[PDB]
């Protein structure tokens, strides 16, 4: 893989959509399914009551997810799976708004965007995925350890490095939640890390407000893709929905964007 000099990382989503019209029919296949299969083997051992307490979800949703683990099999097709960038729904994906992407937009995203995933490890935008719930921070015991950080080890970082240029200045734009970015090993990552941070106002102070911040990470992802950005300095132009760059508040690889109420 050639890789590129700019890679965006975002979180996955809990809500999945396999019924809306496909915005593109082009797809690829996830590259870490041998690992995924091992996790499915463990996940299948859980009863629905165990899923409900472990994942803190309703009995009904635990049942649905028990069935998903039972039903999962690695021969992915459009009849049984959907591209990750289309399947995921939630605040990040509302900001990203992939349903308005052109085929060229999808090609740029396929080169420059990756979703982290408890089950799949690393997803490309066009990678088909079968439905699941397995959040990265879940304490699922496995052959390699007591949780998914121990399971994935350096694998996720190594896969991201494959998508980065072998030499030259690379940047990884961390637009993922800490739960997911914890699966990446910065000392082993072949890139500078830049973390755009979105702060909203409250009582004269600026703070991370989760529902706003998730949508903002999506808006920024879309900004980068739509404008085909190549360099870190270009990210400071982001101003969607009232955010503005704050240079003085930005250090240590954070790029801070503030927004008034």
- Neighbouring-strand partners of residue 194: 173
Q: What is the gyration radius of the CA atoms in the chain, in angstroms?
A: 18
Instruction: Show the binding pattern over residues 201-220: x = contacts Cl ion (CB under 5 A), - = does not.
Output: -------------x------
Q: What are the φ and ψ backbone dihedral angles of 121, each rounded to 5 degrees?
A: 75, -75
* Min separation Cβ 87 and Cl ion, Å: 9
Number of amino acids touching Cl ion (CB under 5 A): 6
For residue 25, the tally of other CB atoms under 10 A from its CB is 8
**Does position 18 bind Cl ion by CB under 5 A?**
yes
* Min separation Cβ 23 and Cl ion, Å: 15
| DSSP for 76-93, written as a single string | --TTT-EEHHHHEESHHH
* Min separation Cβ 215 and Cl ion, Å: 9
- Neighbouring-strand partners of residue 49: none
* Min separation Cβ 217 and Cl ion, Å: 5
The two three-digit tokens of residue 184, written as one number? 């990446």
Task: Give the binding range for Cl ion (CB under 5 A) out of 44-52, 80-88, 107-115, 176-184.
Answer: 176-184
For residue 141, the tally of other CB atoms under 10 A from its CB is 13
According to CB under 5 A, which residues from 73 to 102 bind Cl ion?
A: 92
Binding Cl ion (rule: CB under 5 A), the pick from 19, 25, 167, 203 is 19
Q: Is 210 exposed, middle or buried (0-12, 13-18, 19+ CB in 10 A)?
A: exposed
* Min separation Cβ 102 and Cl ion, Å: 24
Task: Give the binding range for Cl ion (CB under 5 A) out of 105-113, 142-150, 170-178, 237-245.
Answer: 170-178
Instruction: Show the binding pattern over residues 34-73: x = contacts Cl ion (CB under 5 A), - = does not.
Output: ----------------------------------------
**Does position 177 bind Cl ion by CB under 5 A?**
yes
**Does position 190 bind Cl ion by CB under 5 A?**
no
Instruction: Report the phi/psi class of residue 117: left, alpha or beta, with left for phi > 0 and alpha for psi in -120 to 50.
Output: beta
CB 122 within 8 A of CB 184: no
| DSSP for 172-219, written as a single string | EEEES-HHHHTTS-GGG-SSEEEEEEEEEEETTEEE--HHHHHHHHHH
Closer to Cl ion at the Cβ: 18 or 244? 18
Residues that bind Cl ion (CB under 5 A): 11, 18-19, 92, 177, 214
């Amino acid at each position: 893989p050639r890789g590129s000099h700019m890679l965006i990382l975002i979180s996955p989503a809990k809500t999945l959509d396999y019924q809306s019209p496909l915005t593109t029919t082009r797809y690829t296949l996830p590259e870490l399914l041998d690992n995924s299969q091992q996790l499915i083997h463990e996940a299948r051992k859980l009863t629905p009551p165990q899923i409900s307490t472990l994942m803190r979800i309703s009995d009904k949703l635990a049942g649905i997810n028990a069935a998903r683990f039972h039903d999962w099999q690695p021969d992915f097709t459009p009849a049984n799976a959907r591209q990750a960038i289309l399947a995921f729904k939630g605040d990040v994906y509302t900001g990203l708004q992939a349903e308005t992407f052109s085929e060229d937009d999808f090609d740029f995203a396929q080169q420059h965007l990756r979703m982290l995933s408890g089950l799949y490890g690393v997803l490309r935008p066009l990678d088909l995925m079968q439905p699941y719930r397995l959040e990265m921070g879940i304490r699922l015991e496995n052959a390699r350890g007591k949780d998914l950080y121990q399971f994935w080890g350096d694998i996720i970082t190594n896969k991201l490095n494959e998508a980065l240029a072998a030499q030259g200045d690379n940047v990884v734009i961390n637009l993922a939640s800490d739960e997911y970015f914890k699966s990446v090993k910065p000392k082993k990552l072949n890139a500078e890390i830049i973390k755009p941070v979105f702060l909203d106002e409250k009582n004269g102070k600026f703070k991370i407000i989760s529902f706003y911040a998730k949508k903002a990470r999506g808006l920024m992802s879309r900004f980068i893709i739509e404008n085909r950005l190549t360099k870190p300095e270009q990210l400071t132009g982001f101003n969607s929905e009232g955010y503005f760059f704050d240079e003085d508040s930005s250090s240590n690889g954070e790029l801070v964007f503030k927004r008034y109420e």
